[PDB]
Design a protein around this ligand. Sequence first.
Ligand SMILES: O[C@@H]1CNCCOC1
Ligand SMILES: O[C@@H]1CNCCOC1
Length: 340
Amino acid sequence: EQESVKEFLAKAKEEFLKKWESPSQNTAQLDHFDRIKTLGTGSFGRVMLVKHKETGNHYAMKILDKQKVVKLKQIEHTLNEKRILQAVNFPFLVKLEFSFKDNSNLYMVMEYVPGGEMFSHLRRIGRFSEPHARFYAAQIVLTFEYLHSLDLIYRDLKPENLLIDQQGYIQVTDFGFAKRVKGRTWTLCGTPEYLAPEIILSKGYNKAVDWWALGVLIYEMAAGYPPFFADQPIQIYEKIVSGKVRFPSHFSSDLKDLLRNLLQVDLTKRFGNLKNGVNDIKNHKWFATTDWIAIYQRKVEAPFIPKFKGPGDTSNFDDYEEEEIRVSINEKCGKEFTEF
Ligand SMILES: O[C@@H]1CNCCOC1
Ligand SMILES: O[C@@H]1CNCCOC1
């Protein structure tokens, strides 16, 4: 690798480790914010558009219910998410601005990206052209080069987690499955369509699962549907482990070749996991037109700018029932979340 890249990644790792070893804590409180609108909701948390009452800035506030985190055995994952997010710094990662906890909940206050999820745009447009898919893919390649150099596995690559910003660039959100891993890890996590075979088969797996997921993402962006699509998870898993993938005839030969090497069921043969690491991907013919430095510097004109009216516009997000942010009079699960 060019010494320029080595020295960049060495500095990136130094800066990450300093924050990793001494995490920030308790940098805002709930009553500093007005709630605006629920942007997403799940089994143990929600994401809320909020506005800071003094500065007027908008943020996406992820709120996790401590009792539900415990019940669903997600404690370590939530601690991973916050400790990692407060320590990273890269152009295509959403920034954590504040974090805090109270008697009931954990809070991560992130930048708000009003352009919405790639998922919505992809489903509205049908499929992306190869140049359009390649622009997004290149950002993920660089983001994974960064994260993996810090010994971080992301483990949740899917279109819903890629927000499109005001310049048309990606910002990766949701670090709920991200983990610092030297070697292997074992947790079953990730959306069915994106799971690598070694996860399905309950093996000790490594960063190669992220490169598999990139193959799935590129296929889905360029085709409009994922490669192992089926109606129930069991049938999806059978397809994933089979070693077979079919490509639309509109795919270029270069795209097919790259995808065969990312969607390699033998993890010891999978691009991103060989002796040349990420460079087997960056040097592949499908990326021949990609100016990696210009992408990193955000100097490439993006495929499209999402339509939105301003930093408080929620039009590109969905409508959800609005529920209270209740804070118990009594502290819940204090011991489990001491480090948050
Ligand atoms: O945030 C984690 C990963 N993303 C999907 C929802 O599950 C929890
Ligand atoms: O600690 C083990 C692995 N980490 C996540 C799931 O909980 C059990």
